[PDB]
Design a protein around this ligand. Structure first.
Ligand SMILES: O=C(O)Cc1cc(CC(=O)O)cc(-c2ccc(C#CCO)s2)c1
Ligand SMILES: [Zn+2]
Ligand SMILES: [Zn+2]
Length: 591
């Protein structure tokens, strides 16, 4: 193994030979530990609070979930704890028949996915345009420096020679350039999966990439119309730690459809950075803080360019195999059998595969499957054997499915069908309200001025106006925040890193106009394009559903807060200073 990772370690060792040592009291059990070197402590024990959101959400000061979200440990102690819990484990190898089914399915799935699209190299200008339009950090400084691109070219030349010298994954500028350069080369070779939307619903059938949170509920309602059994949505315990050497070799098969110059570079990413990896992890010690250099041959690096697409691919593959077992195509004898008959697997894929892909919604490790019947609930032999063991359930206990698409969890949400005052139907995303308020109250980092804080608050408020307007507390809070923040201040910083976020709220455009564009105009499931001219005609969940999903409506603390909210808005306004504000409260029946 040292012939693939040796150069990378040698470079770290030489760069840090001042403090380099072999700490023989390292906690690594399943990862190969190479050595340590002293570093400054990174991360925080708690998170900075957004004072603007906090001052306008007083009844949530006494909410346990809200308080918990303000915590989250990112220090060396925090990193080490989570590492021990999941990351430091070994997945038993799948049986020979299981490996054969996975291989046949992976081959057919890659050909299906590549039927209209062809893989291609991503460029320096694509990465630059992304880094720019995202930041509008020190990544933009690297992208602007020609010296960064020269290091990129030098690493690429090693990659063409089947070698790696600096591509290290992380759990002054030279160390930073090497990380961003590793991510650029990964983007260059595998970015086409995201950039050319290989996992869009039109291309992949099961996929939802590029669809957006505002479309997922509509997709789940469409799946519910397909005849079959219940809708299943099983969670895998630590999916990324369950990616096997067999899964990686199956994912690699995409290189067969590439141009030779592209195949060479993607092969280097697969063989040197995915199937072999050098990882940096911070660890506290009595002496101080050290960086451990570790390695392994399996699992997925969660921060990588290809992670989402390759998890989506492998999960679509694992769900087709579970569907086959449910249908009696795959038996216990077949999974143990090295000489398993390929014919019936190939016949099922070619005649039923695509129809079976359409019964699913798959986003990385998140899946929803509507099998042809409920034998699937008890079809666990292949799922467990592939290493995709379901979270917090005995291994052989049958899965519990849902007979209502509205009860189905998917991508940290559930979805409600609403009836508007004009009789039109809307399908909206939803989650427990404490999680929404709890997140909005967290600002990211330190040294943030009241201006930047108010603008992040405005971004959260506007995200709620577009996605979660159907929650009474969030519409009130959203209007209060937008009334407290100067009208012309542009929402800055992101509210989420979610691939499902299209960030329509990142604007100073009127939110009712944006609402109309998203839910009416561009909405494929909205036949009648009549605009909604007032927020008074923008619907809410039924009062009972709003309460079931965490609303404080009907509580006295909530009525007190609503009644006294112009006072809290005025307090925020007075501290922000003499700027132009707009009273958004009259857009509600209360004012
Ligand atoms: O990032 C967090 O702390 C929560 C979170 C999680 C997830 C699920 C996931 O991607 O795993 C989605 C979101 C979004 C909020 C609004 C969105 C939109 C839209 C339409 O343009 S997507 C937020
Ligand atoms: Zn490299
Ligand atoms: Zn709900």
């Amino acid at each position: 193994n040292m012939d693939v990772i040796g150069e990378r370690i040698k470079r770290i060792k030489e760069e840090h030979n001042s403090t380099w040592h072999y700490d023989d009291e390292n906690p690594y059990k399943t990862w190969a530990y190479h050595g340590s070197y002293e570093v400054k402590a990174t991360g925080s024990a708690s998170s900075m609070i957004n004072g603007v959101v906090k001052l306008l959400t007083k009844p949530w000061d006494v909410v346990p979930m809200v308080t918990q979200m303000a915590m989250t440990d990112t220090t060396p102690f925090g990193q080490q704890r989570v590492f021990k819990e999941k990351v430091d484990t070994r997945t038993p190898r799948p049986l020979p028949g299981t490996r054969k089914v996975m291989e046949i399915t992976a081959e057919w799935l890659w050909r299906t996915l590549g039927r209209n699209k062809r893989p291609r190299l991503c460029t320096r200008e694509e990465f630059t345009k992304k880094v720019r339009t995202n930041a509008a950090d020190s990544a933009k400084a690297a992208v602007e420096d020609e010296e960064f691109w020269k290091l990129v070219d030098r690493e690429r030349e090693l990659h063409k020679l089947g070698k790696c010298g600096s591509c290290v994954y992380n759990m002054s500028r030279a160390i930073w350039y090497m990380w961003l350069g590793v991510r650029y080369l990964e983007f260059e070779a595998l970015g086409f999966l995201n950039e050319d939307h290989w996992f869009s619903r039109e291309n992949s059938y099961s996929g939802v990439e590029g669809e957006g949170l505002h479309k997922l509920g509509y997709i789940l309602r469409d799946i519910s119309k397909i005849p079959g059994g219940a809708m299943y949505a099983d969670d895998t315990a630590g999916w990324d730690t369950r990616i096997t050497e067999d899964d990686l070799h199956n994912e690699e098969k995409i290189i067969q459809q590439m141009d030779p110059e592209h195949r060479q570079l993607a092969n280097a990413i697969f063989k040197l950075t995915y199937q072999n990896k050098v990882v940096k992890v911070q660890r506290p010690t009595p002496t101080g803080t050290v960086m451990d250099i570790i390695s392994r041959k399996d699992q997925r690096g969660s921060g990588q360019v290809g992670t989402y697409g390759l998890n989506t691919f492998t999960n679509m593959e694992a769900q087709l195999v579970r569907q086959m077992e449910g249908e009696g195509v795959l038996t216990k004898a077949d999974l143990e059998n090295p000489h398993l008959l390929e014919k019936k697997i190939t016949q099922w894929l070619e005649t039923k595969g695509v129809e079976r892909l359409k019964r699913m919604a798959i986003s990385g490790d998140d899946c929803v499957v509507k099998p042809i019947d409920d034998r699937f609930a008890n079809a666990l032999l292949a799922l467990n054997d592939m290493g995709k063991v379901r979270k917090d359930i005995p291994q052989w206990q049958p899965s519990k499915g849902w007979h209502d698409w509205q009860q189905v969890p998917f991508c940290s949400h559930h979805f409600h069908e609403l009836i508007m005052k004009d009789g039109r139907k809307l399908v909206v995303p939803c989650r427990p309200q404490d999680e929404l308020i709890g997140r909005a109250r967290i600002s990211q980092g330190a040294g943030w001025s009241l201006r930047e804080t108010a603008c992040l608050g405005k971004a959260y408020a506007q995200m709620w106006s577009l996605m979660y307007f159907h929650r009474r507390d969030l519409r009130l809070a959203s209007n209060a925040i937008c009334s407290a923040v100067p009208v012309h201040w542009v929402p800055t910083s992101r509210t989420t890193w979610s691939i499902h976020a299209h960030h329509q709220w990142m604007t100073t455009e009127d939110m009712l106009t944006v609402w109309n564009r998203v839910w009416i105009e561009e909405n494929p499931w909205m036949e009648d394009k009549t605009p909604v001219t007032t927020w008074e005609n923008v619907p809410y969940l039924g009062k009972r559903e709003d309460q079931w999903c965490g609303s404080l409506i009907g509580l006295t603390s909530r009525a007190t807060w609503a009644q006294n909210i112009p006072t809290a808005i005025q307090q925020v306004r007075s501290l922000i200073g003499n700027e132009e504000f707009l009273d958004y409260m009259p857009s509600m029946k209360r004012f």
